[PDB]
Amino acid sequence: DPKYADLPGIARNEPDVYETSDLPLEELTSTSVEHIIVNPNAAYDKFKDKRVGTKGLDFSDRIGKTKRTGYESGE
Amino acid sequence: IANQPVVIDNGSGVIKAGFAGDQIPKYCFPNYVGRPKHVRVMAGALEGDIFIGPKAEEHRGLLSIRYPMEHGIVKDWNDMERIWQYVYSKDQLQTFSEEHPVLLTEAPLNPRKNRERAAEVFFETFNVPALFISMQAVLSLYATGRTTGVVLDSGDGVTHAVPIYEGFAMPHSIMRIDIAGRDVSRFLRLYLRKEGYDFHSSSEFEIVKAIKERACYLSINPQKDETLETEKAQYYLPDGSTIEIGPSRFRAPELLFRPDLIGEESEGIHEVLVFAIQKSDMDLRRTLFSNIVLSGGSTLFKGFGDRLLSEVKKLAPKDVKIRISAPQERLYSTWIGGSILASLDTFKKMWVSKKEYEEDGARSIHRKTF
Amino acid sequence: IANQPVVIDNGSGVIKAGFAGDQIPKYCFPNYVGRPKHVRVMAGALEGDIFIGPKAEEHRGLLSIRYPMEHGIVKDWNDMERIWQYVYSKDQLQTFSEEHPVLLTEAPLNPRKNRERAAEVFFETFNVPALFISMQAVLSLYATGRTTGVVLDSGDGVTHAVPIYEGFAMPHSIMRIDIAGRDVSRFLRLYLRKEGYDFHSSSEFEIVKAIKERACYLSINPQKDETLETEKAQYYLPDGSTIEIGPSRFRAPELLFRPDLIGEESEGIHEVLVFAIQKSDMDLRRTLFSNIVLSGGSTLFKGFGDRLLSEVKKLAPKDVKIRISAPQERLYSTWIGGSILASLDTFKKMWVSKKEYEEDGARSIHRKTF
Amino acid sequence: AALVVDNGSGMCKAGFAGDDAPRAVFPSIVGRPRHQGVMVGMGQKDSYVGDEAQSKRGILTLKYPIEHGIVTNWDDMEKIWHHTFYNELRVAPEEHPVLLTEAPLNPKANREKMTQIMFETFNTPAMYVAIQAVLSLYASGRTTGIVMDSGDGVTHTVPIYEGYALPHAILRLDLAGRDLTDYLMKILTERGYSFTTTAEREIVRDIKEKLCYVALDFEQEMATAASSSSLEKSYELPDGQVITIGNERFRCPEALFQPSFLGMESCGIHETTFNSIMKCDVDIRKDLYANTVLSGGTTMYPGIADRMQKEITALAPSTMKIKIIAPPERKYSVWIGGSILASLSTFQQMWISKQEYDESGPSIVHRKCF
Ligand SMILES: Nc1ncnc2c1ncn2[C@@H]1O[C@H](COP(=O)(O)OP(=O)(O)OP(=O)(O)O)[C@@H](O)[C@H]1O
Ligand SMILES: Nc1ncnc2c1ncn2[C@@H]1O[C@H](COP(=O)(O)OP(=O)(O)O)[C@@H](O)[C@H]1O
C-alpha cells in the first residue's frame, strides 16, 4: 500500500490480472462377454470352510518321486 | 501375527495394494519412480527427488519416468524397494513392514531369481513375518467365485493363459508372451511418429498411454478395414493441442493379435488361449471353452471380446459353446481374489514363515509358491 | 562478521539498492556516469567530471553520459566500480563495504568474465564478507510470493522469459532477446526524426527516455491509430520548449512486438513468452499459460497487457486460461524479492565468504551459486 | 541418365547418376531480405537460395525448409528443387528420372507430398525415395552391416544383414548437427561471444566444422583443458575479429555421446547403435559389430571412430570384434549410394512411373518406397 507515494514509477489504474473468460466406461457393455459382478462376500462365504493340507509338498524342479501334486489335504 | 495381511497386486502398470479382507484396493498408484530432470533454483521447491504415487502424476513435467518392472521382471531393485517403502510409508498405509503378512502377486513363468530376490527384499530389508508369492490367475478365479475357467489376462506387460479345472492348474499348458499394454503403447508411439505427432520424453509416454486408453478400438475385420479410410477423429492433448489420430487407432491395438507388427515371432492372444486349451486333455477342453475368464487392463479395448469370439470360433472346433466371462471390476479382480485368499483361515498354513526362510531360504520359497 | 545484507539490484538502466527487510529501496537512480561536454582544464564548471544520480540529473545540457552496462554486460568496469562506490558513498548508504553482506543480480546466460570480474571487485576493492550473484527472474517470483509462473522481465537492455515451475527453473526453456527500453528509446528517436525533432547527445537521449516514459501507448491494432489522426498530445521539454509528438509515441513500442519492421531479427516479447512455454514439457504448458509474471520497466506501456493478451491468444491454443499477472511493483520486483531472499535464514549457505573466495576464486563462485 | 538428389536438413547434394562426386553441393537455405518501407533499385531477387543466400547472408534471414528431416515449408523446398534442377544441374527434370533420399521413420505426409510435387509440379517421369542409410551401405561396398547415419537434423541407425533390412530394429534420434550448432552457439555466448541472429549460426557452424573434434576421454580432456591451455586454438570471423575457443572444441560434439547436456533425456549415438544392434537377431550381431558404418556429415569430426569404438567396446561383450568403418568420403555416402542404385541394371523396375501416380496417387509411395 505505501509503495505508491514513496516510489515514482509505481503507477495506479493498473489491472493487475489480465485474463480470459474461464470457460466451463463404454467398453464393458459388450454382447460378447458375460459381465460378472464380483462379490467378495459371496465368494468368501463359498470358500469359507475349505482347508488346504500342505503336509510335505513341493513345487520346485526336484525329481525324486514319480509325480508331484502339492496341496493334498483339506477338511 | 494377530493382525491383517497386506495384498499387494505387484503389477507392472498399477501396483495396487491394500489390507486383506477389503472389497476394493484403497491405494492404486502407477508403478514408476519420478526423478526430476530440471534443477531447482527458487527455494521452497519440492524435495525428496523421488516422487511416487499421485505426486508424480500431479507433476509429470518435472520428473523423468523410469519403470522398474519391465515385462513383469524387476529390472531396478532400488526402484522397487523405494516403491515398496512408499507403500508402507505414511502416504499410503502408515503401518510397519514388519508386523503384517504380505500377499505378493506375480505373473506366471517368471524367472526364479525374481522370486528369490523379491523374498530377499521382503525378508532382509523389510522383516515381514510371512510372505506368500502367488499367481494372478488363481487369484482371479478366487475373486470370481468360480473354480474352473481359463484365465486369459493381459496386464501392462505380460499376457498369459493358465487353464484350471476345479483347482488343478496344469503347469504345462500355461502360455506366456511378453506382448501387452506397455508394448502396445510403445508401438502406438511409433505409429504416432509415423503420423507426424512425435513424443519422445518419458513424461510424454504416459500421454501416449492416455491416447491408448481413450481412442483405440479393435476392428473385427483387420485387412478389410485396413484397406478402407476412416473419418480421422480428433483428440485433445493436456497441452490443449488437437491431434488427428488417423489409422493408428485401429492398427496399433492389433499387436495383441499379430505380434509380427512389433517384429517378434510369437503367438497372439487368441493363439495363446487356444493353445493353452489344446495343450490340455480331451475330456477337459469343452468346459474350458465354455469357461473363459478375462482380466487385465489390456482387455478393455473396444471390440476386444468380439474379436476374441471371431478368432476363437475360427480356431475352436465346430459346435462348441464358447463363453467368455469377464468381470466388471476387471482391473481389481486379482486384488479382490488376493483379499479373499489372505482373509481365509487356511492362509496361515500356506505361507512362508520368517523362521522357515531363515532356516532354508530360497528352497522354501520355491517349495511353497507355484 | 555479519551485518544487514544489502541488495544491490543492478541493471542496464536503473541500478537499485537498499538493505534487506525494506519493502521500498530508498536509493534508486538511473545507471550512468556523467562527464561534462567540454574537457575540463580548470575549475569553475562541473568539477571532478564524475556525476551519478541526483548530481547527474542536476545538469543535462552540460554533460556527456556514458552507460557502463549494455545488454546486461558490463563494458566499462571502472564506471561500474565508481557507481558501486557511489552506492557506498556519503549520498546513498554511508555504510561500510567490508561489513555488510551484498546481494548481486545478473541477467541469465551472461558471460563468465562478467561474474569473475564482478567478484574480483567485490572481493578485492570492496572486501565484502558475503557475495551471492543471484538471478533476475527467481527474485521476481520471491517478491510475488508465487511458486509457479513464467517470469517475463523487461529492463532497459534484456527481455527474457524463464518459466519456473514450483521452484524448478528450466534452463533449456529460456528465451533471451537483446531488445528493451534502451533500444525502444533509440528507435523512438529514429521515429522522432521522422516527426521533425532531432536529438544528438547522450543527455539528449535521456530526454528522449523521459519522452518515452511519459506518453507511449500500445493499441491492440496500430493500423487503427495509423488510419485515424492522433490529437498530438504535447510534451513540455525540460529545456522549456514544447513538442507535439504525434504517431511516433505508438509506433515506437511496436519494436518489442514486431522488430522485423525496423530491420532487426528477433522474435518479440509475445514470442519470447510463447516460445519459452513451447520449449517446456507438454504437461506444464496448461499451467504456465495461466501463470505469467511480469517485471522490468519496459512492461509499463499503456495497453501492454491487453495487446499481450491478444498476441498470446493468437499463438497459444484455444480455450486455454491465461493470467498475465501484472504487479504494481514491477520496477522493483527484482529488488523486493532479493530483499525477501536475502532476509531468509537459509540464505547463509548461498553466499561465499572472503576466505572461501580466496580458496579457489572463479570456480568457488560458479560452484557455490550453481 | 538418372538424377540423384540428396535433400537433407542442411546441404543439398545433387548430381548425375554414375558420377563419383556430385555436381551441386550447396546449403539448402532460402532467405527473404529485411522487408522495410525503403526501396532497393537496379534489381535484386525476391528469395535467395543456395550460395546466393550464403554470400548475401549479411542481411537476409536464413530459414531452413527442412527441420529434423521434416519438410516444414513445401514452398521453400519447391524453390530449392527448382533452383537445383534449373540452375545447378542445368537440365529439366522431365527428361530424367529422379532419386530422392528421405530419412527413416519419416512421417508419411512428407514421403507422399514429395511425390505429389515431383509429379504434378515438375512433370517428372519417374521418382523413387530411398532411405539414406541404405544408400550409405551401398556406397560403403557392403551388403551386411549397420549404418550410423548422422545428418544435421536427423540421426538414425538402420541394420541390414545380407541385403535385408530390419524395419523394427531401426532407431532414430533428433539429436543431430543443428542441435550441436545451437549448443555451441549457447556456450560461445557463455564465453563472451554473442552470436544471436541466424546469420551468425553459419559462422558458429563453421567454427564447429573447423575446430571441433571428438574427445576420447571427455573428463580427462576437460580437466586438462581447464588445467593447461595449449588446446585453446584461434579462429578468424569474416570480419578482422579473432576468437579463441578452449572447451567448445571437444565439448561441442560431446552432446552426441551425452544427450543430457541438451535435456533430451535420451541415449547417445554409441548406445543408440548398441540398442539398434541388440534389437536384432542374436545370430547376426557379430557381423553388425564388425561392419559398423558411419556416414553423414556429422560423423566428419576428427577422432570420432575411437570414441565410438571405445564406447561400444565397453558396452558390447569382450569376445566381439568391434570394428568401426569410417571412410573419408562419408560426407557424400548417401549421394554415392544413390548414384550406384540409380545406375543399376535391376533398379529400372524399382521406379514409380508417371501413369502409376496417375492411377493410384500419393498412396503408391508406401507400397513402393522400400
Ligand atoms: N569437418 C566437419 N566436422 C564436423 N562437422 C561437420 C564437418 N563438415 C560438415 N559438418 C556438419 O555436417 C553437417 C552436414 O550435413 P550432411 O552432409 O549430412 O547433409 P544433410 O543435409 O544432413 O543430409 P544427409 O544427412 O542426407 O547428408 C552440417 O551440419 C555440418 O555442420
Ligand atoms: N481402456 C483401455 N484401453 C486399452 N488399454 C488400457 C485401457 N485401460 C487400461 N489399459 C491398460 O491396461 C494396463 C493395466 O493393466 P493391469 O492388468 O492393471 O496391469 P498390471 O496388472 O501390471 O497393473 C495399463 O497399462 C493400461 O495401459
Ligand SMILES: Nc1ncnc2c1ncn2[C@@H]1O[C@H](COP(=O)(O)OP(=O)(O)O)[C@@H](O)[C@H]1O
Ligand atoms: N513508466 C515507464 N514507461 C516507459 N518506460 C519505462 C517506464 N519505467 C521504466 N521504463 C524503462 O524501463 C527501464 C527500467 O527497467 P528496469 O527493470 O529498472 O531495468 P534494469 O533492470 O536494467 O534496471 C528504463 O530504462 C526505462 O527505459
